[PDB]
Amino acid sequence: IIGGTESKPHSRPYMAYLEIVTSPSKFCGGFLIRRNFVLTAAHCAGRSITVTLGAHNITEEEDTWQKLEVIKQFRHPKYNTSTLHHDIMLLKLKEKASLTLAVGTLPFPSQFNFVPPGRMCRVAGWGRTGVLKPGSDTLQEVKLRLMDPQACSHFRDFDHNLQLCVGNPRKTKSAFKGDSGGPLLCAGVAQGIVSYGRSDAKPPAVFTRISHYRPWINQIL
Numbered sequence: 001i002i003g004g005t006e007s008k009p010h011s012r013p014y015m016a017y018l019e020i021v022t023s024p025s026k027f028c029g030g031f032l033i034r035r036n037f038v039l040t041a042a043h044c045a046g047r048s049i050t051v052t053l054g055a056h057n058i059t060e061e062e063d064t065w066q067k068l069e070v071i072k073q074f075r076h077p078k079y080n081t082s083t084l085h086h087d088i089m090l091l092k093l094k095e096k097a098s099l100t101l102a103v104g105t106l107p108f109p110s111q112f113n114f115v116p117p118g119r120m121c122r123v124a125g126w127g128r129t130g131v132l133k134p135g136s137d138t139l140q141e142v143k144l145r146l147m148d149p150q151a152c153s154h155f156r157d158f159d160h161n162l163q164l165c166v167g168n169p170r171k172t173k174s175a176f177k178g179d180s181g182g183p184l185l186c187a188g189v190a191q192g193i194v195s196y197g198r199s200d201a202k203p204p205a206v207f208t209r210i211s212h213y214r215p216w217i218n219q220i221l
């Protein structure tokens with residue numbers, strides 16, 4: 001998260017931190033939708049994934065931490081490994097998390113509108129705070145603007161109708177590396193998932209549209 005501020009501790013109890021091991025390690029975001037299911041981006045898939053819940057500080061272990069092993073990675077069946085179309089994945093945790101002050105579920109409303117540009121939303125994560133910067137010690141959140149699709153025209157495989165263009169190009173505020181899989185929260189409802197952007201972190205970034213995959217996510221609910 002670039003250009004954001006520290007969240008109030010445990011004010012985002014659904015946030016998940018992913019430690020991914022390949023067959024090199026990756027770090028992603030995610031959010032708890034149910035006690036044993038985490039929603040994240042499909043490109044975060046690897047061999048081993050460990051989920052940390054109930055964390056504000058990610059660098060030193062807290063009493064509110066809950067670490068769970070992923071036992072199944074359910075990528076969307078039409079996910080494209082290079083163009084990142086349908087970049088959404090369901091993770092089944094080995095055990096059930098404990099609902100506490102620090103661990104909670106993100107509720108999904110009965111209606112998911114196709115959200116047009118112009119909306120102001122929030123994204124949170126422990127990702128890099130800038131280009132070449134390390135991951136944030138604590139959970140950061142930044143307010144971002146849903147941009148017109150023409151602002152993401154430089155991305156070769158961007159599709160306005162499948163993805164969100166998020167981030168004012170004249171600022172530095174944006175999600176970045178390590179924030180992938182984290183939710184884009186508009187008005188308290190997760191409308192997007194951090195997918196990708198530019199290596200030099202110049203916004204906008206590309207977000208998966210959650211509204212398209214509500215019936216598919218309804219498998220878990």
Ligand SMILES: COC(=O)c1ccc(NS(=O)(=O)c2sc3ccc(F)cc3c2C)c(S(C)(=O)=O)c1
Nearest residue numbers: 043082083084175176177180196197198199205
């Ligand atoms: C068609 O796909 C691509 O064009 C592409 C681009 C970058 C990239 N990964 S990235 O460089 O670490 C990066 S930059 C950035 C900026 C803002 C942001 F919210 C996130 C990110 C991320 C993840 C990948 S990916 C995840 O599949 O490896 C794919």
